[PDB]
């Protein structure tokens with residue numbers, strides 16, 4: 197059970213850790229988050245009380261290092277850093293614990309929500325989408341654009357999601373124009389799964405990561421990516437049976453977790469109606485269709 | 497973007513462009529079967545690909561054999577249109593290739609876009625104009641060559657005959673669309689107007705009769721009257 201200590205909390209801020217969140221007042225004696233489950237990636241994130249423009253946060257895996265947060269009064273943000281001195285770090289944490297100046301990761305034992313949202317998400321894949329190789333953790337915020345959005349402007353600050361474009365030569369074999377456009381199976385299975393991602397777990401990992409960035413930061417290009425990766429599967433007539441079953445589970449927990457008051461902007465009516473009611477896989481997403489119908493019948 | 501009444505002179509500038517109308521690609525007669533069900537029988541069709549500036553018409557005849565054992569024909573017909581238009585473009589010398597293709601029906605956009613991926617600098621555009629190109633099969637010589645075809649065939653025409661010797665492209669297009677609109681609205685009456693005077697003939701190498709300038713004015717007025725007469729019948733106004 198690992199810990200991310202905080203040097204201090206000098207500005208009022210809502211702090212998130214995965215799907216949980218805590219309000220911290222200016223100069224309150226907050227010194228971190230303990231009991232963080234080992235085995236998953238995690239995200240710590242921040243929305244400042246005084247300025248709600250720019251949600252930001254850090255993806256990390258405590259197995260990869262000892263990480264802490266410290267407020268930078270010059271750039272105006274809570275920054276993640278790595279402490280290389282293990283004794284120094286254990287000492288700081290043990291003192292903060294002894295003074296009970298830390299919140300506990302509030303995981304219900306029965307609850308598999310975070311596992312289910314991050315099942316295929318791997319820190320090494322995050323670091324390839326978010327390139328900053330000098331750190332072991334990854335910064336994401338509300339405003340970062342994706343490579344695809346850019347093509348259509350600072351490359352060092354981009355989200356390098358895999359580009360999906362249904363009207364591209366990559367997606368359309370010469371001589372199979374109609375076939376490949378109406379049935380995206382060759383683009384899904386040969387180009388994307390066999391070629392770029394190598395396996396379905398990596399594809400699902402990027403899909404899950406895109407969703408979480410859309411949800412936690414309102415990152416619009418991530419929402420575009422999540423929907424494109426759903427649509428590519430649903431628009432393929434030939435999909436391994438294990439992938440369809442797993443997709444139904446992935447989307448179910450994503451729809452379950454999405455704040456009800458955010459469905460308007462984060463859910464794309466066209467993709468969902470096409471995926472659940474028109475596409476080849478309209479009948480392969482039973483759990484997802486049931487929760488969408490009971491929770492968001494308007495959109496549909 | 498979309499072509500409409502606002503940007504209408506763009507059709508007659510010096511950027512090569514083609515209209516593509518797919519209305520008459522997939523043509524069927526609907527009939528009853530011995531058991532009393534309904535069946536279709538295809539007849540030959542055509543793609544109507546027109547340079548509005550020069551009058552050059554690329555009439556690709558679509559022979560019923562292309563549909564043989566094919567399902568979802570109305571969908572397939574859009575993709576076949578797009579395949580044949582892309583093939584036409586590839587067959588033209590580079591300096592003859594269009595810079596824009598305007599589809600008369602928005603459902604042609606995605607099929608044509610996908611077939612034209614090798615041509616990223618050719619813009620595929622819809623149009624808000626209601627154009628009467630479905631009536632192309634009311635031009636006797638075009639209908640005749642389509643029906644007589646026994647195999648796929650491309651036939652080249654100038655749909656303006658020699659009008660451009662005396663009038664501008666804008667005026668020629670306006671005459672063409674008036675004629676076709678009249679033939680679309682009341683074919684029998686329009687054809688009567690065009691052939692009422694036996695002394696005015698169609699040249700072997702033309703589609704329309706050899707009217708003088710003054711006779712064209714009379715014809716055009718008679719076509720406008722026909723369209724208004726028909727309108728007051730449609731709506732009782």
Ligand SMILES: CC[C@H](N)c1ccccc1O
Nearest residue numbers: 244247249250271272273
């Ligand atoms: C983009 C900077 C802006 N003052 C800002 C907005 C919110 C939180 C931190 C932060 O520095």
